[PDB]
Amino acid sequence: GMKSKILIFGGTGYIGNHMVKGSLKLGHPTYVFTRPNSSKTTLLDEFQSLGAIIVKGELDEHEKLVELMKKVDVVISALAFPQILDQFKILEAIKVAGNIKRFLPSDFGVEEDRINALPPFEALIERQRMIRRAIEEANIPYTYVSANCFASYFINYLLRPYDPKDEITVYGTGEAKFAMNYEQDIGLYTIKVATDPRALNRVVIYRPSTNIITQLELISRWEKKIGKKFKKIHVPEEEIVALTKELPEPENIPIAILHCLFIDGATMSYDFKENDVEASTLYPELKFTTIDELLDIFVHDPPPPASAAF
Amino acid sequence: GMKSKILIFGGTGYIGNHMVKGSLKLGHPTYVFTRPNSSKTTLLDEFQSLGAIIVKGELDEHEKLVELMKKVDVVISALAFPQILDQFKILEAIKVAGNIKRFLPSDFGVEEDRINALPPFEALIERQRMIRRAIEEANIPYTYVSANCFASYFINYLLRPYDPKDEITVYGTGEAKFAMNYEQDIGLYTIKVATDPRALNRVVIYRPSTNIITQLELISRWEKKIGKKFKKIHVPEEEIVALTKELPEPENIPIAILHCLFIDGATMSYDFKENDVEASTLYPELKFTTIDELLDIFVHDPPPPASAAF
Numbered sequence: 001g002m003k004s005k006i007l008i009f010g011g012t013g014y015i016g017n018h019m020v021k022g023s024l025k026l027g028h029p030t031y032v033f034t035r036p037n038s039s040k041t042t043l044l045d046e047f048q049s050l051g052a053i054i055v056k057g058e059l060d061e062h063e064k065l066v067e068l069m070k071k072v073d074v075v076i077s078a079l080a081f082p083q084i085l086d087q088f089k090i091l092e093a094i095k096v097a098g099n100i101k102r103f104l105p106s107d108f109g110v111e112e113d114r115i116n117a118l119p120p121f122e123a124l125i126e127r128q129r130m131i132r133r134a135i136e137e138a139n140i141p142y143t144y145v146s147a148n149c150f151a152s153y154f155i156n157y158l159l160r161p162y163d164p165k166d167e168i169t170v171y172g173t174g175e176a177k178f179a180m181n182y183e184q185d186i187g188l189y190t191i192k193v194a195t196d197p198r199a200l201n202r203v204v205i206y207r208p209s210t211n212i213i214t215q216l217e218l219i220s221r222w223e224k225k226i227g228k229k230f231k232k233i234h235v236p237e238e239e240i241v242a243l244t245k246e247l248p249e250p251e252n253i254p255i256a257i258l259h260c261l262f263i264d265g266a267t268m269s270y271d272f273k274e275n276d277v278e279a280s281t282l283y284p285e286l287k288f289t290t291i292d293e294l295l296d297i298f299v300h301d302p303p304p305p306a307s308a309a310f
Numbered sequence: 311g312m313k314s315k316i317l318i319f320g321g322t323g324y325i326g327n328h329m330v331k332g333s334l335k336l337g338h339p340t341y342v343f344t345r346p347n348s349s350k351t352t353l354l355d356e357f358q359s360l361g362a363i364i365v366k367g368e369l370d371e372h373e374k375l376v377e378l379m380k381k382v383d384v385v386i387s388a389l390a391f392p393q394i395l396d397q398f399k400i401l402e403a404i405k406v407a408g409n410i411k412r413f414l415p416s417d418f419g420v421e422e423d424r425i426n427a428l429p430p431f432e433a434l435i436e437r438q439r440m441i442r443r444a445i446e447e448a449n450i451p452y453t454y455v456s457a458n459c460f461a462s463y464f465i466n467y468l469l470r471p472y473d474p475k476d477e478i479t480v481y482g483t484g485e486a487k488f489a490m491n492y493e494q495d496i497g498l499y500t501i502k503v504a505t506d507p508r509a510l511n512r513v514v515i516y517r518p519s520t521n522i523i524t525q526l527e528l529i530s531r532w533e534k535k536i537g538k539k540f541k542k543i544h545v546p547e548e549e550i551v552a553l554t555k556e557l558p559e560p561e562n563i564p565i566a567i568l569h570c571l572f573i574d575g576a577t578m579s580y581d582f583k584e585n586d587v588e589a590s591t592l593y594p595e596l597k598f599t600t601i602d603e604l605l606d607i608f609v610h611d612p613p614p615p616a617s618a619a620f
C-alpha cells in the first residue's frame with residue numbers, strides 16, 4: 001500500500017540480513033541488490049520466500065543502479081568496510097535518479113563524527129565521514145545510525161561460549177562501559193527509523209539503558225547464568241596500542257577497534273546532543289532485547305560466531 | 311591401467327586440491343571424499359571434469375568409509391587442524407577394510423616428532439603425534455610428509471604483495487631460516503612418494519636447497535624484483551611469546567606458529583636422520599619451483615592470499 005519501497009545493498013551480509021527480514025516483517029516491499037557470483041544462494045532463496053525482490057548486479061553498473069533507484073523510496077547500505085568508498089557509486093545513482101526519500105549509509109557502529117580512534121581504525125571511519133560529507137553537500141535526505149556493538153557478535157567474541165576453556169581474555173582493565181544490541185532488533189529498528197519523520201536528517205543512536213555494561217560485568221553475569229568461574233587474563237592497553245603499530249593490515253584493524261570499544265569505551269564516552277535521537281524511546285510497542293535476555297538465549301540456543309571482513 | 315587407486319580426504323582444501331590435481335595428472339584413479347553441504351561445488355565440478363570420482367558423505371558414516379576403503383589402495387588425508395583427531399574415524403575404517411597399502415595422515419608442515427613449540431601450537435602437533443602413534447601401533451603402512459612452509463601462502467602472508475604499503479612486518483630478528491615450497495609441487499610430490507617404495511614407512515621432508523631463506527633475504531629479493539624499498543618493522547620475540555599466553559584461542563595459534571617458523575626456525579633447526587628421505591633427490595625428471603621462480607610468478611600472475619582454519 002502506502003508502505004515505502006526499500007532497497008538494501010549488502011542485504012545478505014551479517015547485519016544486512018536482519019534489515020532485509022525486518023523490512024519484510026514490517027510489510028515493506030523489499031529489494032535486495034546482490035552480486036551475480038555471491039555464495040549467499042540459500043539465504044537469497046529464504047529472502048525470496050519471504051517476499052523480497054532479488055536484483056543481481058555489480059555496483060559498477062551505473063545505469064542499472066539508476067533505473068533501480070527510480071523504482072524505490074528508501075536506500076539502506078549495509079556494505080562492509082572494504083567497500084566504504086564504493087558507496088560513492090550508490091550515491092551517484094541516487095543523485096541522478098533524484099527521487100530517493102532517505103539514504104542510510106553503512107555505519108551501524110560507533111558515532112564517527114564525535115570520536116577518534118587509533119590510525120588503523122581512524123582511516124576506516126574517516127572514509128565513512130567522507131560519505132557523510134558528500135550526502136550533506138548534495139542535500140540528500142539521510143539518517144545516520146550508530147547501532148553500537150552487535151550483541152551476538154561480541155558475546156561470541158568476548159565470552160567464547162562455545163569454548164569449554166577455564167580462562168577468559170579481558171582487554172585493558174575491562175572497566176570501560178559499552179552498549180550492545182541484538183542484531184535482530186538493530187535490523188528492525190533500522191527499518192522503522194528509515195521512514196520515521198523524527199529521524200529525518202538526524203543521527204540516531206541505539207542505546208537502551210538495559211544494554212550498557214562493562215567486560216567484567218558481562219563476565220560476572222555469564223558466570224552466574226552457567227554456574228562456572230573463569231580466570232581473567234588481561235591484555236594491557238599499552239600492549240594493544242603497540243600491536244596496532246607493528247602488526248600488518250588487516251590484522252591490526254580488529255586490535256585498534258578492540259581498543260576503541262573496550263578500552264576507550266567509545267560507545268559510552270559521550271553525552272547526547274540536542275538533535276540526537278535515541279531509538280529505544282521512539283516506539284512504545286517495541287523494545288530492545290535486554291542483556292539478561294540475550295544471555296538466556298546463549299544458554300538455550302546460542303547463535304554461531306562471526307568475523308567481520310577487513 | 312595398473313596405477314594404484316587413491317582416496318583423498320579434504321581434497322577440496324587449500325593443499326588438498328593440489329593433491330587431487332596431481333593425482334589425476336599422474337593418471338591415478340582418484341576418489342574424493344567431501345561433505346554433502348560443502349560449498350566447494352565449482353571446485354568439485356572441476357575435479358569431475360578432470361576425471362575424479364566424487365563421494366559425498368560424513369566421516370561419521372563408518373560403514374560407508376569401510377566399503378569405500380575396500381575399493382582403493384592409497385589413502386591421503388589433507389584435513390584441517392580442527393579435524394586432526396577426527397582422523398581416527400578414517401583410521402578405524404582402514405583397520406577394518408585391511409587392504410590399504412599406504413596411509414598419509416594430515417601433516418604437511420613441520421616435523422612434529424623432532425620439534426617442540428609453544429603451548430598453542432604444541433597441543434595441535436601433539437594430536438598429530440597421537441595419530442602417528444596409532445598408525446605404528448596397528449602396523450599400518452605409512453609415509454609421514456613434512457612439506458615445510460606453503461610458499462604462495464607465506465609469500466602472501468609475509469610480503470602482502472597485494473598491499474601497496476611502504477612498510478613490512480618482520481617477526482623477531484628475521485634471521486631465522488626456513489624452507490618454503492610451491493603448493494602445486496607439494497601436491498605432485500606427495501602423490502609420487504605415496505607410491506614410491508623408497509618412502510614406505512618413512513618420514514619424507516620437502517627441503518630443496520633452492521628454497522631455503524630468511525625473512526630479511528626474502529624481503530631483499532622481492533625489493534629487487536619490483537624495484538621498491540620497504541621500511542622494516544620488527545615484532546620482538548618476547549612480544550610474540552606474551553601474546554600466545556594472553557590472547558584467546560584460536561587467535562593465539564597463528565602467533566605461536568609464527569614464533570615456531572620464523573623465530574625458532576623449526577623447519578631448518580635440524581639435520582636429516584639416517585632414515586629420512588629428502589624428496590627433491592627422488593625424481594630426476596622433476597624439481598621444485600625455486601624461490602626466484604616463485605617471486606617471478608607473483609610479479610606476473612600472483613595467486614590470492616589464504617588463511618588456515620583454526
Ligand SMILES: NC(=O)c1ccc[n+]([C@@H]2O[C@H](COP(=O)([O-])OP(=O)(O)OC[C@H]3O[C@@H](n4cnc5c(N)ncnc54)[C@H](OP(=O)(O)O)[C@@H]3O)[C@@H](O)[C@H]2O)c1
Nearest residue numbers: 010012013014015034035038078079080106109148149150
Ligand atoms: N557494530 C558492530 O559490532 C559491527 C560488527 C560487524 C560489522 N559492522 C558494520 O556493519 C556494516 C556491515 O558489516 P557486515 O559484517 O554485515 O558486512 P558483510 O556481512 O561482511 O558483507 C555485507 C555484504 O557485502 C557484499 N559484498 C561483499 N564483497 C563485496 C564486493 N567486493 N563488492 C560488492 N559487494 C560485496 C555481500 O553481499 P552479496 O554476496 O549479496 O553481494 C555481503 O553480504 C559495516 O559498515 C561494518 O563496519 C559493525
Ligand SMILES: NC(=O)c1ccc[n+]([C@@H]2O[C@H](COP(=O)([O-])OP(=O)(O)OC[C@H]3O[C@@H](n4cnc5c(N)ncnc54)[C@H](OP(=O)(O)O)[C@@H]3O)[C@@H](O)[C@H]2O)c1
Nearest residue numbers: 320322323324325344345348388389390416419458459460
Ligand atoms: N605448511 C603450511 O604452510 C600449511 C598451511 C596451511 C595448512 N597446513 C596444513 O595442511 C593441512 C590441511 O590444511 P588446509 O588449509 O588445506 O585445509 P582446509 O582447506 O582448511 O580444509 C580441508 C578440507 O576439510 C574439509 N572439512 C572442513 N570442515 C570439515 C568438518 N567439520 N568435517 C569434515 N571435513 C571438513 C573440507 O572439505 P569438504 O568441504 O569437501 O568437506 C575442506 O576442504 C593441515 O594439516 C594443515 O595444518 C599447512
Ligand SMILES: CCOC(=O)[C@H]1C[C@@H]1c1ccc(O)c(OC)c1
Nearest residue numbers: 108109110148149254257258308
Ligand atoms: C574487535 C572485533 O570486531 C571488529 O573488528 C569490528 C567489526 C566490529 C566493529 C566495526 C565497526 C564499528 O563501528 C564497531 O563499533 C561498534 C565495531
Ligand SMILES: CCOC(=O)[C@H]1C[C@@H]1c1ccc(O)c(OC)c1
Nearest residue numbers: 418419420458459564567568618
Ligand atoms: C602463520 C600463519 O599460518 C598458520 O597459522 C599455520 C597454517 C600454517 C602452518 C600450519 C602447520 C604447520 O605444520 C606449518 O609449518 C610449516 C605451518
